[PDB]
Design a protein around this ligand. Structure first.
Ligand SMILES: CCC[C@@H](C)[C@H]1CC[C@H]2[C@@H]3[C@H](O)C[C@@H]4C[C@H](O)CC[C@]4(C)[C@H]3C[C@H](O)[C@]12C
Ligand SMILES: CCC[C@@H](C)[C@H]1CC[C@H]2[C@@H]3[C@H](O)C[C@@H]4C[C@H](O)CC[C@]4(C)[C@H]3C[C@H](O)[C@]12C
Ligand SMILES: [Zn+2]
Lengths: 50, 86, 50, 470
């Protein structure tokens, strides 16, 4: 918008280009993690945790 | 804003007055790009743009062009909420 | 509307509308072939049903 | 009954199936009719000239030699060129010899030699349409003349038959008739100008044709007889093949397209075969029809079946993939995987992924998911284009803060910054235009803008603004 431009120009903050779509605990719930399991497709890298 | 509601039969001329264009083809959207087709049920030239203030091609993309009809597409650059009343 | 997983959800009206257009188009086509009246009458009955 | 299919069955079942001899005689009637129309059109010297023009234009390499003409009634370009040269020679010798009794035989010979040639269906249709348009214009002129001279003047039809018929070309039958001492003749004076102009156009057209208009009417009537005969023969052929088409349609019943839609698409395919069938090859009709009927039904399924239309080639790819997957499931055991399917097929295996990813039919928004209070799938789908009210409140707060900060600064720099961006103004400008209104040479505007940015950079001058920043 014509104003976020001014703020960016003043502080020289840059853009992201990626969102923050991550899994987070639903509000009001407090437990401990007892298990994590990862299912990767047959053509994916299988990072260190997997 | 008003004080009564009147109901009646609609003439062919009135039905043509409401409309913004004729739907000719039975198509809806593209199977690869997911964009509306030229005269389908979902069509930008008839029912308005699919994003706030920007033509379908992408040539015009700001409210400094509000209200202009694109030369290459025909899609008016307006609010997409207009696609809910045309 | 698009749902998660590359799958769409649609209203029934779209379906119904499509029917009309299809049959309507066919009628306009059939009258250009001067087809025998039995076929055109069948198409008009189908359009009325649609 | 209420089923359209029931009524179609009733109205269809009344006609009996043709036998071999029946089909043969219908075909020969069709051939005779088309031959009649062809001969009728052959008597028009105005189409040979257009054909010559097209041949010359193609000789200028505007198109292909073969495409212009579908061969002759006889295979090599040399023979076609020789025949064209002969046609041109005959045409010129006939045209340059109008001077009347002898020109008729020359025109007859030209028509006879021309008849040896064959024309493409599209170009023949165009020629027929042009001739019909000319005839329609002439008839419209005649009908306008009749309306002007009859309804306005109550001119008896007997006088028109006696006068108009016989010459049809000169204006005597009207101008001389004006002096017949009759009320219609005296009334014609007011409408004499319109009649005169119509007769001028009639004379021009008749000169263009160069033949008696009575011959034109006879030719049109004979062509109409041929067309009616051809259409009636086609109509007779159609019905037995309708009973044929219903079975092919049965074989495709449940594919997302209604039964009656399939039947109607099959009916267009039978009509397409009929017009393109031949008894010479001596192949029973059903064999020739079935292929076109099936092709039409399959293309109809490829086009109409899906809401998000998928091209025909992609539909063929999907069907082939399904067939190979079925074979591999039956044979190999558990189920083919995309890698195995790609191996059995021949594709980069990334195309196979896309083909498998092509979305199936959309889920109806009324599907009864709810199972409680009769809730449906459409009640659970949110609107993601809306702006949260906190976002709008923040936008207004930022607008107020920016207004305040700019008000803090002086006037010239305030407006320089404001116009540099779109702040409070719909339009946007750059250094060049900004220099125009402040009488500046594009330098001291960039320096002013930098100075304003520096000043706003100062702490304790802009802190709420820094707060708005994430
Ligand atoms: C079965 C009882 C009613 C209801 C719970 C069933 C009936 C059909 C089910 C949907 C479709 O099957 C498949 C859709 C796409 C994905 O495959 C998973 C999601 C998807 C919307 C499903 C959600 C739900 O599960 C539905 C609505
Ligand atoms: C009775 C409660 C059923 C509920 C547990 C499950 C079963 C199927 C789920 C819906 C489907 O996935 C289809 C959609 C997917 C999109 O992401 C938008 C949400 C969407 C409507 C889902 C919301 C919810 O998660 C549903 C209703
Ligand atoms: Zn455009």
């Amino acid at each position: 918008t014509p104003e976020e431009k001014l703020l960016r120009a003043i502080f020289g903050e840059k853009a992201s280009d990626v969102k923050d779509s991550s899994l987070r605990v639903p509000n009001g719930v407090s437990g401990t993690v007892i298990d994590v399991q990862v299912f990767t497709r047959d053509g994916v890298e299988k990072d260190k945790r997997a | 804003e008003f004080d009564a509601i009147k109901i009646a039969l609609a003439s062919p001329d009135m039905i043509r007055s409401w409309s913004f264009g004729e739907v000719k083809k039975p198509e809806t959207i593209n199977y690869r790009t997911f964009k509306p087709e030229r005269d389908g049920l979902f069509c930008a030239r008839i029912f308005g743009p699919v994003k706030d203030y920007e033509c379908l091609c992408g040539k015009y993309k700001r409210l400094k062009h509000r209200g202009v009809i694109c030369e290459k597409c025909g899609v008016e650059v307006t609010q997409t909420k207009v696609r809910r009343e045309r | 509307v698009p749902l998660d997983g590359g799958r769409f959800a649609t209203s029934d009206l779209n379906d119904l509308y499509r029917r009309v257009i299809n049959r309507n188009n066919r009628l306009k086509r059939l009258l250009d072939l001067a087809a025998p009246d039995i076929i055109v009458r069948n198409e008009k009955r189908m359009l009325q049903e649609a | 009954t209420t089923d359209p299919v029931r009524m179609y069955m009733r109205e269809m079942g009344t006609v009996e199936l043709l036998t071999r001899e029946g089909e043969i005689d219908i075909a020969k009637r069709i051939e005779d009719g088309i031959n009649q129309v062809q001969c009728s059109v052959a008597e028009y010297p105005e189409a040979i000239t257009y054909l010559l023009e097209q041949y010359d234009r193609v000789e200028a390499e505007e198109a292909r030699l073969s495409d212009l003409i579908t061969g002759f009634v006889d295979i090599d370009p040399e023979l076609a060129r020789e025949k064209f040269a002969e046609l041109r020679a005959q045409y010129v010798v006939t045209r340059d010899t109008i001077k009347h009794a002898t020109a008729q035989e020359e025109i007859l010979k030209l028509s006879e030699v021309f008849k040896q040639f064959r024309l493409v269906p599209k170009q023949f249709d165009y020629l027929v349409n042009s001739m019909r348009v000319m005839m329609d214009r002439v008839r419209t002129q005649e009908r306008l003349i009749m309306k002007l001279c009859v309804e306005q003047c109550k001119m008896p039809k007997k006088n028109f038959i006696t006068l108009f018929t016989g010459n049809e070309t000169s204006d005597t039958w009207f101008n001389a008739a004006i002096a017949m001492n009759k009320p219609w003749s005296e009334k014609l004076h007011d409408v004499s100008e319109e009649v005169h102009r119509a007769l001028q156009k009639l004379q021009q057209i008749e000169e263009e044709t160069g033949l008696t208009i009575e011959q034109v009417k006879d030719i049109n009537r004979r062509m109409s007889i041929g067309e009616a005969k051809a259409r009636r023969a086609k109509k007779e052929m159609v019905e037995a093949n309708l009973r044929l088409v219903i079975s092919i349609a049965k074989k495709y019943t449940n594919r997302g397209l209604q039964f009656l839609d399939l039947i109607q698409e099959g009916n267009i395919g039978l009509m397409k075969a009929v017009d393109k069938f031949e008894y010479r090859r001596g192949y029973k009709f059903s064999t020739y029809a079935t292929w076109w009927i099936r092709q039409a039904i399959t293309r109809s399924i490829a086009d109409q079946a899906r809401t998000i239309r998928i091209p025909v080639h992609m539909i063929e790819t999907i069907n082939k993939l399904n067939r190979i997957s079925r074979q591999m499931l039956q044979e190999m055991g558990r189920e083919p995987t995309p890698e195995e399917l790609a191996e059995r097929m021949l594709m980069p295996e990334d195309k196979i992924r896309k083909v498998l990813k092509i979305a199936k039919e959309p889920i109806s928004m009324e599907t009864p998911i709810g199972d409680d209070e009769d809730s449906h799938l459409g009640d659970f789908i949110e609107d993601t284009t809306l702006e949260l009210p906190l976002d709008s409140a923040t936008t207004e707060s930022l607008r107020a803060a920016t207004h305040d900060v700019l008000a803090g600064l002086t006037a010239r720099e305030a407006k320089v910054l404001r116009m540099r961006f779109g702040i409070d103004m719909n339009t946007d400008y750059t250094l060049e235009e900004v220099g125009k209104q402040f009488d500046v040479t594009r330098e001291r505007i960039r320096q002013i803008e930098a100075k304003a940015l520096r000043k706003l950079r100062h702490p304790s001058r802009s802190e709420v603004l820094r707060s708005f920043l994430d």
